[PDB]
Amino acid sequence: VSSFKANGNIEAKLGAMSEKVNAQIESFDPRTIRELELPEGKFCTQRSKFLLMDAMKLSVLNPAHEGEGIPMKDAKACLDTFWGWKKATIIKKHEKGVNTNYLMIWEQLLESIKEMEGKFLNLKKTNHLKWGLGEGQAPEKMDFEDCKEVPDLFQYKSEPPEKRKLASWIQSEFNKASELTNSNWIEFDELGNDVAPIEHIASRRRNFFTAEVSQCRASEYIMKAVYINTALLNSSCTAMEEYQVIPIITKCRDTSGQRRTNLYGFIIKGRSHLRNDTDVVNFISLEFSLTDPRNEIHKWEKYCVLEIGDMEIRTSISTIMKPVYLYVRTNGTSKIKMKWGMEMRRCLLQSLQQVESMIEAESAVKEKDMTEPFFRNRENDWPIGESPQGIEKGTIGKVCRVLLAKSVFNSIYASAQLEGFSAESRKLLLLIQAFRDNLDPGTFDLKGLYEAIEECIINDPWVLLNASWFNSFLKAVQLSMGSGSGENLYFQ
């Protein structure tokens, strides 16, 4: 090494090495390339920790602030507004579960709420409740020597996940997440006073952002996530051995002005001796709904839907009687998942900085604040959806809510599948963008990239829909371009 001197050593072995070892640039054209294949199987089922569009609220007019008053007192206050309960009946069976336990759990809960005298409610460890919360379902830990000789002792099931097909409900769920509501779901804490002129500008723009984000349906889902995961985390830590009851509460302020407390249902925390950050707390989630589960039975694979009452619902025309369903299911979560659920408000930041960078980018060109023109006028609009008529556009407020929904759904349906899909499909998007900028993009192994993407589309409802969204996007880019040597790179 001390006496080595170069003498065409690289060029020599470059000559020796096979010409199979090469990186052939195959020119990339988005008109040539295929759609991503989505897997086959049974349909993908809802896997959120709470109902989204299918939820239903009992509520009271109440001046109490976002986290004020005792949760179970507010729960009992919300129950007292509703009458016309019934003897519960199973209207849709959880195929893998003992469904009489789900019925007995509801009846035990409802009677224990009636009998409670205090701030918290711990349920008695009944046989039906013990089953629902997975009592004693961990195999007992022995030394290997003692159990070495057992026939069916194998290693834990370590297979890839079972593939599932893209159901229509996830697109439907996302549509509702992007909508406005009649209620301000998020309350913001105080700032210091605005002194700087840019601080006054900020706060003017913040006025637009706040109303748009707070009244969006996705923000209701944020506040449900933030409440549930906070309650489950705190109770998991303090009340480890108790089956503690956690009512599903949010609080909001109408656009009319009145403050309101809402009750979606209840959660029964199982035992929660959570050592590792992946360790599971089992819980039962009993949630109100008007949605008939039989219209999409595939959506509710894990749920046992009871029918618990009848509600007289008022409208502009006349009153309607509708049945009240209680979507019961066993479910689970961890310290890491709970922690991230408690921090779901950061979704607001992901949407709004993208929105604000869009507003600011135009403001640089126009050399004035384009905040008010964007929210008040409907001149500047971006493609955000497809109908049978075609590619529909929307205002900056719509984009804010759609991007917010995306970030909330990334949070609710987090997975390794989403991670891998998002990172690999980002390369394919940039290649399409490179072509659209007239920069002559080239791949080396395009098949391998496609496989790296498609490998991650296994079973998750949210990643299946995002894969579908890419295909819809690809087709939209193809039709705008069309055939030609000098085609239509500009959209519309």
Binding site: M56, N182, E212, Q215, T255, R314, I317
Partner: peptide, 19 residues
């Protein structure tokens, strides 16, 4: 600022039913 969308639900809300 009141945000508004071009969309409706003529009869009732299944999430916030008037009862």
């Amino acid at each position: 600022y009141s945000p508004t969308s071009p969309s409706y639900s003529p009869s009732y809300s299944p999430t916030s039913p008037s009862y």
